[PDB]
Structure 1
Amino acid sequence: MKIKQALFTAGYSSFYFDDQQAIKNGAGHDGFIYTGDPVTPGFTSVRQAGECVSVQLILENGAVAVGDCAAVQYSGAGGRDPLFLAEHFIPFLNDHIKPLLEGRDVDAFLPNARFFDKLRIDGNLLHTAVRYGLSQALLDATALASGRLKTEVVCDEWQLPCVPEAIPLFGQSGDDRYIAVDKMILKGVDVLPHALINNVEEKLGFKGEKLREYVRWLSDRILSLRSSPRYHPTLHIDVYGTIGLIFDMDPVRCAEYIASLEKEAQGLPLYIEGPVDAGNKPDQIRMLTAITKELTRLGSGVKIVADEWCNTYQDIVDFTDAGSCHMVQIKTPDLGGIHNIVDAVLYCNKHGMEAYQGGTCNETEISARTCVHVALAARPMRMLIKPGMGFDEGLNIVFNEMNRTIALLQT
């Protein structure tokens, strides 16, 4: 079965593109607006409306396959591709990509995904967001062409068993780190709450005391508000390299502090994401490896998660092969074609690395829904509730698609 027509439509994604560097530099704010000038290439303001491009593929059988081109909030940061604006990409896609899609056979997914993942226009690989959206739509096309769910296509082409089972979900609070926790407890979230600990003085504390007090508040809140003692979620907090900043980038001192947080969790498993940011991939791998080594030496039960500088499929392989940390965030839009997510999760699983199938608040309902199918097939240890910063909406999107799909698979 062929694609008859391909359509590209501009839209809004579920958050904003933020110039992370300008914010780190100290940009002030006025309401939701960051002031001053941006510094990251592509940005014309420190904060810009998040955008996407929807891909629709009308097939010969009349079905319409969908996918969304989307990019992370902190685009252009940490080795990632630049922010993604529809204005530029709509003509580009209509001119250069539409003719490569129309008439294309979709009975299989992988060959098409690989083709677009390696395509170069004017010398450059397609933006990861374009590969992300195209690959979502191509997976959906193969599914709709053959009476299969997207999950089933993945299980068939990767020769995976496809046992119907939920994936633990992780809710992110943004700066709403108190109110969002209550929401997450009310909705029985498996892993929480991210907490956006992205400032030393006010969020982590100069000696880590603020984060210490937050973990205690968090575990207390869970133990106080939960409707049954059966609710025993995992704590996962992202510190945006701030721990490294207060301990002179000393992996041993970092590990000591991280280990000291275990008591504050009151028996709930604890994960700390992005403990340090070494500023480049090789140094980041070495630094996380050293922290992991010291955590083990201490007999700590606290785990660390790689994120910064771990973008592509090969990056994930490199962090895994080095035994650098316990878990890696596979930040889905940054991998380009979604077949790379499947390969990354399987690579992690084979080698004992915990796969966190993440993503961004700045993606879409379609990209998130598609990611649910990738996860149900590949079996990561954790999946981000996305998109958006409201939490409720992302949970509705991810949890319900997951449970709807499990129910379908069970028929």
Structure 2
Amino acid sequence: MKIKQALFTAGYSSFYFDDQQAIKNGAGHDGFIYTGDPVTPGFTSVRQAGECVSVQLILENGAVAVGDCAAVQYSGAGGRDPLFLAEHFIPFLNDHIKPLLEGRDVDAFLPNARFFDKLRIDGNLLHTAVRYGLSQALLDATALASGRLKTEVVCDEWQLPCVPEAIPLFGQSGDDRYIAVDKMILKGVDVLPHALINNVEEKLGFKGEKLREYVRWLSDRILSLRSSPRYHPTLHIDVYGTIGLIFDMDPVRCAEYIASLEKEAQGLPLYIEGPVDAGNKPDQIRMLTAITKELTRLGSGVKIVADEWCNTYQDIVDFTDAGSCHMVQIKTPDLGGIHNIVDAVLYCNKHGMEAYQGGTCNETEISARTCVHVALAARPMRMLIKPGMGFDEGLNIVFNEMNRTIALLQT
């Protein structure tokens, strides 16, 4: 079955494009807005509305497959592609991509996914968000053309068993790290709460005591508010590199502080994401490795998670091959085509790496819903609740699609 028509429509994503460089440089705020000038190219303000381009593929049987082109919050940075402005992309996609979609067969997914993932227009690979969104629509197209769910298509093309089982979900709080923790306990969240620990003075503390107290409050809040002791979630907190900054980038000292955090967790397993940011891929790998070695040496139970500098399928391979850390964030939109997500989760699973199928608050209901199918197939150990910073909406989108899908499969 073929695609009869391809449509591209501008839209709003579930968060904001932020100029990471200007913010790190110390941009001030006025309400929700950041002040000063942006320094990153394409930005009209330090903070701007997040945008997406919805792809709809009307098939010969009349079904309408969907996918959303979307980029991370910090669109333009850390090895991630540029400022994804949608209006500009509509004419471009209508002109160069539409004729490559209309009349295309979608009985299978992968050959199509590979094609768009490698395509250059005037020498330039397609923007990674376009690859993300097209690939979602193509997966959905294969599903709709054959009476399968997206999950089944992946299972079939990658020859996976497709045993219907929940994926642990992870909630991110943004700066609302107290109120959102309550929300997450009320809704049974498996993993929590990110906490956006992204400033040294005000969030980590110059000697780490602020984070220490935060973990204690968090575990106390969980134990106290839970309906029963059967609720025993995992703690996952992203420190956006700040721990290296207070320990002279010495991985032994970083490890030491990290281990010291376990006590405050009160039996809840603990994960610390992005402990350091050495500023380039090779050094990031090596520092994470050295931190992991010392945690082991200490007999620590605390685990660490890579994110920055770990972007593409190949990066994920590299961090994994090096034994650098216990888990890596597969930040979905930065991989491009979603077949890359499947490939990356399987590689991790084969080689011992815990795969966290993450993403961004700045993607959509469609991209998240598509990611749910990818996860139910590939079996990562953790999935980000997304998109949005409200949390409730994200949980609604990911959790309910997961459970609907498991039921359909059990049929």
Give, in whole Å, the separation in 2 of the partners of 1:207 and 1:198: 14
Shift of 1:44: 1.9
Partner of residue 100, structure 2: 100
> 1:121-143 CA distances to partner (integer Å, 9 max, x unpaired)?
11111111000000000000000
> 1:148-195 CA distances to partner (integer Å, 9 max, x unpaired)?
000000000000000000000000000000000000000000000000
Other structure's SS at 2:407 match? helix
Other structure's SS at 2:36 match? coil
Partner of residue 10, structure 1: 10
> 1:65-87 CA distances to partner (integer Å, 9 max, x unpaired)?
00000000011121100121112
Partner of residue 365, structure 2: 365
Give, in whole Å, the separation in 2 of the partners of 1:22 and 1:410: 49
Partner of residue 202, structure 1: 202
Shift of 1:21: 1.2
> 1:59-106 CA distances to partner (integer Å, 9 max, x unpaired)?
000000000000000111211001211121111100110000000000
Does 2:242 match 1:242?
yes
Partner of residue 111, structure 2: 111
Shift of 1:387: 0.1
| Comparing 212-221 and 74-83, the one that deviates more | 74-83
Other structure's SS at 2:356 match? strand
Partner of residue 333, structure 1: 333
Shift of 1:298: 0.4
Shift of 1:379: 0.0
Give, in whole Å, the separation in 1 of the partners of 2:297 and 2:21: 35
Shift of 1:245: 0.4
Other structure's SS at 2:97 match? helix
Other structure's SS at 1:210 match? helix
Shift of 1:43: 1.5
Shift of 1:395: 0.0
Shift of 1:272: 0.2
Give, in whole Å, the separation in 2 of the partners of 1:213 and 1:130: 42
Give, in whole Å, the separation in 1 of the partners of 2:174 and 2:77: 18
Shift of 1:24: 0.8
Matches within 5 A, 1:163-178: 163-178=163-178
Matches within 5 A, 1:37-52: 37-52=37-52
Give, in whole Å, the separation in 1 of the partners of 2:299 and 2:188: 30
Shift of 1:261: 0.2
The alignment's TM-score, normalised by the length of structure 2, stands at 1.00
> 1:377-404 CA distances to partner (integer Å, 9 max, x unpaired)?
0000000000000000000000000000
Partner of residue 390, structure 2: 390
**How many residues in Structure 1 have an aligned counterpart in Structure 2?**
411
Other structure's SS at 1:62 match? coil
Shift of 1:45: 0.9
> 1:180-229 CA distances to partner (integer Å, 9 max, x unpaired)?
00000000000000000000000000000000000000000000000011
Does 2:161 match 1:161?
yes
> 1:272-320 CA distances to partner (integer Å, 9 max, x unpaired)?
0000001110110011000001111100000000000000000000000
> 1:217-275 CA distances to partner (integer Å, 9 max, x unpaired)?
00000000000110000000000000010001100000000000000000000000000
Give, in whole Å, the separation in 1 of the partners of 2:287 and 2:123: 34
Q: CA RMSD in A?
A: 0.4
Partner of residue 288, structure 1: 288
Unaligned runs of 5+ in 1: none
Give, in whole Å, the separation in 2 of the partners of 1:126 and 1:212: 44
The alignment's TM-score, normalised by the length of structure 1, stands at 1.00
Does 2:321 match 1:321?
yes
Other structure's SS at 1:49 match? strand
| Comparing 211-220 and 75-84, the one that deviates more | 75-84
Shift of 1:41: 1.9
Give, in whole Å, the separation in 2 of the partners of 1:243 and 1:43: 30
> Which structure 1 residue ranges, 4+ long, deviate > 2 Å from structure 2?
none
Matches within 5 A, 1:60-139: 60-139=60-139
> 1:9-55 CA distances to partner (integer Å, 9 max, x unpaired)?
00000000001111111000000000001111222210010000000
Give, in whole Å, the separation in 2 of the partners of 1:44 and 1:122: 26
Other structure's SS at 1:261 match? helix
Give, in whole Å, the separation in 1 of the partners of 2:325 and 2:125: 30
> 1:338-383 CA distances to partner (integer Å, 9 max, x unpaired)?
0000000000000000000000000000000000000000000000
Shift of 1:112: 0.1
Give, in whole Å, the separation in 2 of the partners of 1:43 and 1:351: 40
| Comparing 24-33 and 35-44, the one that deviates more | 35-44
Other structure's SS at 2:144 match? helix
Give, in whole Å, the separation in 1 of the partners of 2:74 and 2:240: 12
Give, in whole Å, the separation in 2 of the partners of 1:281 and 1:36: 30
Give, in whole Å, the separation in 2 of the partners of 1:14 and 1:180: 17
Give, in whole Å, the separation in 2 of the partners of 1:89 and 1:356: 30
Give, in whole Å, the separation in 1 of the partners of 2:44 and 2:19: 9
Other structure's SS at 1:14 match? strand
